[PDB]
Amino acid sequence: MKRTFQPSTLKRARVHGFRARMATKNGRQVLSRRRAKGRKRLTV
Amino acid sequence: NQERVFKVLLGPHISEKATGLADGKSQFVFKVATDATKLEIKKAVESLFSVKVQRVTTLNVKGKTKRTARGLGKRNDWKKAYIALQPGQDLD
Amino acid sequence: KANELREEKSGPVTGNNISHLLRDQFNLRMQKATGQLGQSHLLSQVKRDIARVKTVLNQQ
RNA sequence: GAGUCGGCAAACAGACUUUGAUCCGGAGAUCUCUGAAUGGGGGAACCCACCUAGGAUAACCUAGGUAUCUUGUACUGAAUCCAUAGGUGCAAGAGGCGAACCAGGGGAACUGAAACAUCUAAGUACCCUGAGGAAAAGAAAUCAACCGAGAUUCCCUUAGUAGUGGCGAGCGAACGGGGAUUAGCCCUUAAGCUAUUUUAGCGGAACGCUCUGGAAAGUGCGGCCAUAGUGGGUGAUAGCCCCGUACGCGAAAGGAUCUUUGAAGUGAAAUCAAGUAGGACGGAGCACGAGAAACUUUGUCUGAACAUGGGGGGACCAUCCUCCAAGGCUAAAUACUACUGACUGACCGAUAGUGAACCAGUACCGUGAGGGAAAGGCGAAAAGAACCCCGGAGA
RNA sequence: AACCCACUCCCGUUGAAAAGGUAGGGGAUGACUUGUGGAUCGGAGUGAAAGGCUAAUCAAGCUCGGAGAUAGCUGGUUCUC
RNA sequence: AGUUGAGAAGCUUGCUGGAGGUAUCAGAAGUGCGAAUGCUGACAUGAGUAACGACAAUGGGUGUGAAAAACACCCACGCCGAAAGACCAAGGGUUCCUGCGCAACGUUAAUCGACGCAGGGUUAGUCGGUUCCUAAGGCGAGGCUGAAAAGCGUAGUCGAUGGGAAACAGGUUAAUAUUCCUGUACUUCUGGUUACUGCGAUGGAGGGACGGAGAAGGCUAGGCCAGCUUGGCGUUGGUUGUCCAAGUUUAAGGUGGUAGGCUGAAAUCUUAGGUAAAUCCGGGGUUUCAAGGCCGAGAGCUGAUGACGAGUCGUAGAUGACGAAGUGGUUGAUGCCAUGCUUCCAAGAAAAGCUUCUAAGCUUCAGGUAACCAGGAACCGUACCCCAAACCGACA
């Protein structure tokens, strides 16, 4: 039956994208923390 | 510009679908620069081969992806233009 | 070389020189795409020769 | 200074020899699109543009410009007569990021008390805002007793002492000694001043025969070096085979540090103090939980003397002592390490040491924040097995 | 009848399936079903109300810090004489 | 393997191994494991046991090959056919096609593959995007509010699942076509030219612009029948037949203004309204006339003398050329007219392009009006799957 994940690219970018994280103040701290660990991606 | 004409063409492409195309019609396949418009390769054919061409179509190719140990390999991607000449003046 | 090019020629004369070896760069990209280029040393040489004449123009 | 075309790794093609080719250091030129991202928007690495001066053929290209806020500075001018708001043009600055350190704003709970409400934990964790290479603090309305000491900051004692505390758990000074370091001055505002090292290099001493061995640095047998003898690595154990090790020279050119030096700030460089001191309820900080509670603070309400005054000496009062509050400026001793460079180890030796010696914050697991592995070794040298036979022309 | 839902029996329970299947059932022009896009969040939302749902987790999620929380309670504690 | 001590343990040697080891006596300890439903790799018993994923069936032949129940072709059986067929949207990300392979994968074998290595392969003025305008909602200069972070919101500018120009038919391919090719079309823009001429806003008006249910109709796609061409003469009993099989196709656009619907029209003066103005709309007065006018499927004619066509003829296996009939009668939709019509209460989106009005400006060049040749239409996505072995469920 209906599993709990139905994919879409327009909903993914507006919630978890870069311009969404960079807009707020918590999200810019999510960027610096995830960058300074050294991850390859930063924008899932 | 004085330049920018000697940049937008990177040679022919000849293969099974391009060999039969240039014989039955007059259409020649060039592996053009990575970002060029339909005007500025209409001019770079009239300047570098001295022939008149009626119209030009283009398309983009995605690079094929290899999967091996210790990496994924994305090959380079590239544009491609079919140059449809006049019925005379097949080019070189 | 570079000491040759600083002999004055001009802004225009060396400015004519660039449109010469862009032809020689064009013909070496056409022959490589086809089957006939053995002198692979020539192909990596005019890249280092266009760079010289652009240097002696953006400075004097 | 004779070889070279980066690493995981072959065959092509070629550049210079004795010097500028690789190769190392200084300075410059280019520097696509994203990102504070800043011409307007966006789903980060995309779309649509204007303006100006030039060039270009019914289709464009060069070259710059074009964000908001502060300050200033012109021009401009609403209801409104004047003239402020407001609007444009220009100049200068800021914005973002970074491990810890410092000062402020806000500030828990578990847990202790063998339960638990005061109290501890604790003004600790965390969250914001500033600034600096350190910051803050500092030049007596301070402490001592009738003797005297003269800024602050930091370590060692006084001392787990006087105190404080459901007088429970607990929390805990000062005075005085010993040290480190050794300056004091005054008006942002009556009337202000606020010469050496460093990034590249170069020279650098002394050994021969003889055995065994695949191969001598080892067995033998002698000699030499020394301001450099416990280094590395060379076919096995090398002061004397190779690279290095003790001293000097530096350096076109930059950098920094002390100087002269330039401006300006670094700033040597004048007074002084009104809604101020005190007071009354309500809170904080003082080791100090309304306690005989001094003193500093400030949310509400009030209010002085003119340095013939004033305020301090732990309720309070008289006598003595000692200092000038309501304006400012300051080096040194001090705290820290994301980043370097030398060195050193009664530190580890691939289930240890970083999560990570291996292409590791990777693979993978998650809508996300986030979590997060396993993985070293042929030989001195590829000399990495020509050729033959069975096999699918393979394994 | 499509379509949405889940009343009964049997099979399945190491399933084909971390909730299905084959037979039968109820609504089926409306207090309907549904596609795309948005809004509401942790002593806080939503709820024709069952303490139900909020990413297979819910009488108060998930993750990282305080934090090696506290355990008069269980389990274990390595060579000789 | 031997041997020595009360014990922890010590000592000497045979083989493998191929470069490090530590008397003695003192120090420093990450100092001694069988057990913690201990932790991480290896290997057992269960056990060559259960299972091998719907109870839509396969049986021969010929081929290739080292080897065919499963691969290819052939002949014959079965099964879905409101899907087990075609196509768009998501989503995926080269799985599509061809050479070369078969160790691993695929619940077995494989010469086969959505599997390895190497090449190839997506063509747009009109189809979807971008560009224009907006709904819910987001962000938000200035501005208020707040210990700090920040919160709310005006101008404004983003946000489709909606609203805004235009194309269809046939050929071609190992693999792409409404994109290339032939054929006939349509829309918008720029530069000249010519004949002239009141141009102008983001501001007014008009329009765009819409609910449920129901019923009259009118067409059309499609489907059958009957003719008509090309071929056939048999199942053994019958069948030159009033028989048998197959084929009888054709678009967008032009012209046309019908079924049917809505609607008074025209002149002329005037005006407390359209936040300014208006020659536009609104309101008022007179007069003349029966109504205009605006929408609108579809038929017919044309596109089309053309294409396509069973076939036939010229390794004729692949191709080159030729090519007959191409018509009438009926029955038709849940498909278009219909964004209509009537009825009922629960009273049924916005904004722009489009048409017109004028303000400032006006220099009436500019700007507009037709007519005309001349040219242009940028950039992204186009392969394959899509009730599925390619997407969501750890899996074919």
Précis, in short:
This is part of a larger assembly, with chains A (about 45 residues), B (about 90 residues) and C (about 60 residues). Chain B is mostly beta strands and about 90 residues long.
Describe the structure.
This is part of a larger assembly, with chains A (44 residues), B (92 residues) and C (60 residues). Helices cover 52% and strands 0% of the residues of chain A. Chain A is mostly helical and 44 residues long. Chain A has a single domain (1-44), classed as Helix Hairpins, CATH 1.10.287. Chain A is elongated, with a radius of gyration of 13 Å. The termini of chain A are far apart. Chain B has helices spanning 16-24, 43-46; strands at residues 9-12, 27-32, 53-61, 65-68, 71-74, 78-85. Helices cover 73% and strands 0% of the residues of chain C. Chain C has 4 helices and no strands. In chain C, helix 2 packs antiparallel against helix 4. The chains are: A mainly alpha (44), B mainly beta (92), C mainly alpha (60). Chains in contact: B-C. Chains B and C meet through strand 1 of B and helix 2 of C. Chain A binds 3 RNA strands through residues 1-20, 22-23, 25, 30, 32-34, 36-40, 43-44. It is classed as ribosome. Keywords: Ribosome, Pseudomonas aeruginosa. Pseudomonas aeruginosa 50s ribosome from a clinical isolate.
